């Protein structure tokens, strides 16, 4: 029934996918009640402040990200004097722990609307778990996932959603959230 318990949203504001040393931009659903609203990474069952809260639903930045935060976020929300509740979770990956994975394609990267066209992530050297395909702008982490390789992933019968650049990530089930530097980028034009 989780239907009858909306949550406050967390969203990132800036791409979850984040290279080493770089950084991010989050904001939570403002609960008016609430006396302080922090942006907390878990780990297991412990949540741990992180982030600068800027100084209106609140938003923070994590600068300078590494692999101790990449993770599972949730910002905790303090009211009265002993309840603590949360926003929805949101997941950061930090990239740049594995050489890079190869991107091709199997046909044109210009299409008309209808035809289809499948993108494949391989690597000729660690053989990484599982692949994913991110398109540049996407502020959630990818839905294109797969534990096969060659991983493919057909994106049609394509439409004007489709274009954009794509990039894809290897890893290893064992790290969830650190992913490999980006391979080539490859452009997909619908028109």
Known sequence: QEGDFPMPFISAKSSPVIPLDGSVKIQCQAIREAYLTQLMIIKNSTYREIGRRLKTDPEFVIDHMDANKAGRYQCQYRIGHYRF???????????????????????????????????????????????????????????????????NFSLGPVDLNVSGIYRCYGWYNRSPYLWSFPSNALELVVT
């Open 85 to 151: 509740r949360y926003s929805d979770t949101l997941e950061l990956v930090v990239t740049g722990l594995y050489g890079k994975p190869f991107l091709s394609a199997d046909r044109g990267l210009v299409l008309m609307p209808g035809e289809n066209i499948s993108l494949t992530c391989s690597s000729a050297h660690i053989p990484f778990d599982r692949f994913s395909l991110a398109k540049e702008g996407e502020l959630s982490l990818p839905q294109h996932q797969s534990g096969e390789h060659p991983a």
